Design a protein around this ligand. Structure first.
Ligand SMILES: OC[C@H]1O[C@@](CO)(O[C@H]2O[C@H](CO)[C@@H](O)[C@H](O)[C@H]2O)[C@@H](O)[C@@H]1O
Ligand SMILES: OC[C@H]1O[C@@](CO)(O[C@H]2O[C@H](CO)[C@@H](O)[C@H](O)[C@H]2O)[C@@H](O)[C@@H]1O
Ligand SMILES: OC[C@H]1O[C@@](CO)(O[C@H]2O[C@H](CO)[C@@H](O)[C@H](O)[C@H]2O)[C@@H](O)[C@@H]1O
Ligand SMILES: OC[C@H]1O[C@@](CO)(O[C@H]2O[C@H](CO)[C@@H](O)[C@H](O)[C@H]2O)[C@@H](O)[C@@H]1O
Ligand SMILES: OC[C@H]1O[C@@](CO)(O[C@H]2O[C@H](CO)[C@@H](O)[C@H](O)[C@H]2O)[C@@H](O)[C@@H]1O
Ligand SMILES: OC[C@H]1O[C@@](CO)(O[C@H]2O[C@H](CO)[C@@H](O)[C@H](O)[C@H]2O)[C@@H](O)[C@@H]1O
Ligand code: CA
Ligand code: CA
Ligand code: CA
Lengths: 413, 413, 413
């Protein structure tokens, strides 16, 4: 065949009760810095776009060829001309050679790839704008090596960079070796990471950028992909247990954190489900919790847990009422790192969003959708103290209740 | 259906009688700073490109779905690699849900939209590179609410930003509420603008960026869309009378000027027509005049009137001779704002441009076209004094007559 | 017709025997600064992408219409988000009017164009990532003016810029006039270049950027396009003899070098061939040699010669073994320019690269291909002294043997 255009786009407005700007984002809480994402409905004011241009090809012998480029940009500005603050950048550029006649045995229907890409098998928890696992970078590998006709595996090498790619003395390559095995509903992912002399990166001045930074890492994922809402109702669900040590201590963006100590230790649990309550109501609960010790400073600790609950109610074939509630508890002990002060407390979010679409309302993933919304946000005052250049506690976002309103669209195809 | 690729692109060269650079642009005159556009033929040396990638969709029930992104860049450099000066940026990203089976009554054939976009109903005077009205930003709204079967209306909320989107104390959101009514050839547009605490934006130093800047504004447009050359000959024409106060004092780019005073008052007239003189000649006159008082400085005044005249002459089915004459009078009293000195005088432009195309020559909008040209420009010497970093009066562009030559292409599809 | 998406994309990884970064690139040798490219197989660690979006159109009368934009970006970073270092930029934007019913005689099937583009008739030596001739910029022209039914010619005007396009006193336009004639396998190209007052460009401080820089230039290309491997075996081959003086002294990127002296004199020879040794082996030898005197400093001299040899061996219908050997000699006498020290010596490169593809292996240009590789590089220690911020001699790339490994994809469609 030929060309295909795919992509994602969110774009909207959010204002407080006075018709002016406020803070918003799935990562605005102090916990957000270590991955503590909260509900995103009516809580995203940026114009984010991803453009996927593809060149597919099928040969008569069954062999496939595929090329894809991803160009992305994310703007907080509402203006029609954002050249000065543009973030337009090529995120992906890779080729896939699939179903080769020459590959036999366990390599029968396997697909070889190379270039810069997001791993095909990454997966996320949509309502919280957080990936469960996100393996990206530049490299190569093979998908779907079928063993015994009931155990498939992926093997790959992904390369990333740490520090300033322009400053040779403050730049390091981080490599990741990963084997991903799938056996029915079960998934076992194991990665080995390594960035030689990461601890010896000198900044522009001549001093050590870190000194106690890790040079290696280990990462693992244990996942369960169900075809029912946790086995008790129609729907679907996914549960994943993540573990990381050293450079592997950042369990979502694998190999994306160059500041982790050798002893940085992380455990994380991601879980969510989709289930129809009635021919008009659908519910999707999700939880993300993490425990990270000795991450950036000796003796530090970052603990938080997010609970998100999205509910849609079909009224028409085109109109639905969506609701979202987020709850997050956090206890962060930064030990002076980044001028952060130890903090603990909770964050809450309530959103009511009338939604229009043409697709199946009971489907959380049917996308052309336009929504109007209102949110209420509150939190323990102590969280204001985590940072001084933070969102919580800045000018006009420190009181108890904060109200926001807006309109936005979101799609993918 | 699926994917659609649409766009615009102009690109070419302009040199003076010595084979070296000169000044060019529809906005080069002192009047240009307040909107005083002049003829653009042979007067645009940049490579400007707009790329529109769309994903349209039609459901069996008549409902439509549409997503569009616009990526643009504008370069003055003639080089094949402009990475260092690139202005590539996402101008638009929106979705439209049209003709929903669930929308009845006045909402019958209406289309709902959200995201970042240029209003569907903006319209321009092409030969002068000036929109009559340009509503753009991020928001949402609805098009074509049919009342009594002879009165359609559009309602919407558009959001924009003033100042540095990165500097929190020098950054403000400006919101625009607008109702646009159409009744046959008549159009009545009304907008309310509001940017809370615009007057309190402190620059990076700590001082007020303005102090006497407006926080609100009002804007109106009275348009007449004819199906004849001003009712006296075959063709078409449009006339619009624009008025603005406060933040609405910038009558073209609505909500785009954050330095306007509360008492800034502006009146503007836009008018043009298209008419075939014979089966081989076509003429298009256009006029843009403006009166703006107390705009940026107390007691200031900007007045100017542009007269453009584009003539084409079919010689073949592929060759045409195009001519353009521009005349502009201006009287500007800046009262010391920006180091500008009060000035008054006139500007002239004559352009002869052999043109090649495949489309209908009598049509001013059939686009694939390549043109060669020569231009002569002259103006009142006094205009050289408006500014010191101006175009008129810079090194090599201060004498009486100024000749230019070049080639350029222009399209849209 | 409508839309066409075409492009090029290379993307991969290169690491040394310690799993860390190394130097790589077809232009890393001291000779590279004056065009001395070496083998590129397994010697390109960047993610370079070119996206070509086109809008073609054919009218019933045979007349064609074509619009093309090329958007490119090149990153050395392996990361999935390169907004901070993005080089995304519009490289081309042009229109072509082909086969006009009105064009008769020698203009019969000729094609008119204008805008920013790379000349349709540029051609390169692929394995060494070097164009033989590269005419690009902004202008207009005509392709295929048929004389006597055995002599075709292209005539064109190309515009380029020297210096900082933003700094008016350090900015100059360089214009190129070129006539390119083809008579069977023979090609004769002649260009006149001129940048008025190039020698008078004052940098930001107020001093002359150069002072002894050239204002004009001359360029000539003599080429032979064969339908056999140098007339002794099946295949193909091309040989070109290039000459340049003054501004024409940079014989590849015509009009792209603003620092050349008036007496800069350059001779270059490019030649390569393609030939199948057997139904499984294919060989492609290539040579690039250059002699450049009085280039940037009076009495300077840059001489070098690159010999590249690519060999592929089909093992399957999808698996091939590719080998590449590069040899380069250089004798450079910079005469103090840029802090370079006169140097002489040779560079060697051996690369073994198992390659996967679906297309014709014996075809060096069939593209979807994924390769794994290992390279060995060594050079005369003296070359380390050419510059201090060079690649040869930097930290960890100064010893004798340097090994590298990696995987990468490369395509075009
Ligand atoms: O359809 C798969 C494809 O969609 C993207 C957006 O282009 O992700 C969106 O859709 C997913 C469902 O398949 C959601 O889980 C996700 O949150 C949403 O952004 C791609 O990332 C994915 O490849
Ligand atoms: O799939 C792309 C990739 O983008 C990230 C940012 O790294 O998230 C953006 O794109 C998603 C598309 O699926 C959106 O759902 C998300 O809202 C947006 O921020 C990744 O999380 C995702 O893997
Ligand atoms: O065809 C409508 C579409 O064309 C654009 C360029 O993409 O505007 C061009 O064509 C108009 C005629 O429809 C001209 O009036 C205008 O000056 C010209 O740039 C778009 O702006 C418009 O949506
Ligand atoms: O339509 C896009 C929008 O771009 C502006 C700049 O804001 O003008 C550019 O794009 C036009 C496309 O119609 C071109 O005709 C014009 O020459 C170019 O500068 C607006 O005026 C226009 O509405
Ligand atoms: O196929 C022509 C077209 O391909 C490009 C890449 O898009 O060049 C590639 O293919 C050429 C063979 O036709 C190679 O010689 C060249 O090295 C390779 O990059 C374009 O440059 C060319 O227009
Ligand atoms: O064809 C585009 C043009 O790009 C240059 C850089 O000016 O080279 C890049 O693009 C080529 C596409 O054919 C690639 O083959 C090449 O590897 C890449 O660096 C020119 O050499 C080429 O003419
Ligand atoms: Ca805070
Ligand atoms: Ca001046
Ligand atoms: Ca060196």
């Amino acid at each position: 065949s030929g060309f295909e255009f795919h992509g994602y786009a969110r774009s909207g407005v959010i204002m407080n009760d006075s018709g002016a700007s406020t803070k918003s984002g799935a990562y605005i809480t102090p916990a957000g810095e270590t991955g503590g994402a909260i509900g995103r409905l009516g809580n995203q004011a940026d114009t984010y776009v991803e453009m996927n241009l593809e060149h597919k090809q099928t040969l008569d012998n069954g062999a496939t060829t595929r090329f894809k480029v991803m160009v992305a940009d994310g703007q907080t500005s509402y203006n029609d001309w954002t050249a000065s603050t543009s973030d337009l950048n090529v995120r992906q550029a890779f080729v896939e050679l699939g179903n080769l006649p020459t590959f036999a045995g366990p390599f029968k229907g396997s697909t070889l790839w190379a270039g810069k890409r997001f791993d095909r098998d990454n997966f996320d928890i949509h309502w919280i704008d957080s990936d469960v696992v996100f393996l990206a970078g530049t490299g190569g590998g093979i998908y779907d090596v079928k063993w015994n006709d009931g155990l498939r595996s992926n093997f790959s090498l992904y390369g990333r960079n740490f520090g300033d790619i322009d400053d040779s003395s403050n730049s390091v390559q981080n490599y990741i070796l990963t084997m991903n095995h799938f056996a029915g509903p079960l998934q076992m992912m194991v990665s080995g990471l390594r960035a030689k002399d990461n601890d010896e990166r000198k900044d522009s001045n001549g001093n050590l950028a870190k000194g106690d930074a890790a040079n290696t890492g280990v990462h693992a994922l244990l996942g369960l992909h169900n075809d029912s809402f946790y086995g008790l109702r129609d729907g679907s669900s996914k549960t994943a247990l993540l573990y990381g040590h050293g450079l592997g201590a950042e369990v979502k963006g694998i190999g994306s954190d160059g500041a982790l100590r050798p002893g940085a230790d992380t455990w994380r649990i991601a879980s969510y489900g989709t289930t129809p309550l009635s021919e008009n109501w659908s519910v999707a609960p999700a939880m993300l919790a993490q425990r990270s010790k000795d991450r950036y400073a000796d003796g530090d600790s970052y603990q938080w847990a997010t609970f998100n609950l999205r509910l849609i109610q079909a009224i028409n074939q085109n109109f639905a009422l969506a609701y979202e509630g987020s709850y997050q508890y956090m206890d962060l002990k930064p030990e002076g790192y980044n001028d952060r002060q130890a903090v603990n407390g909770s964050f809450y979010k309530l959103t009511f969003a009338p939604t229009f679409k043409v697709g199946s309302i009971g489907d959380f993933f049917s996308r052309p959708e336009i929504r109007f919304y209102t949110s209420w946000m509150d939190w323990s005052k102590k969280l204001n103290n985590y940072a001084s250049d933070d969102a919580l506690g800045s000018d006009g976002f420190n009181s108890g209740g904060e109200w926001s309103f807006g309109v936005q669209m979101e799609t993918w195809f």
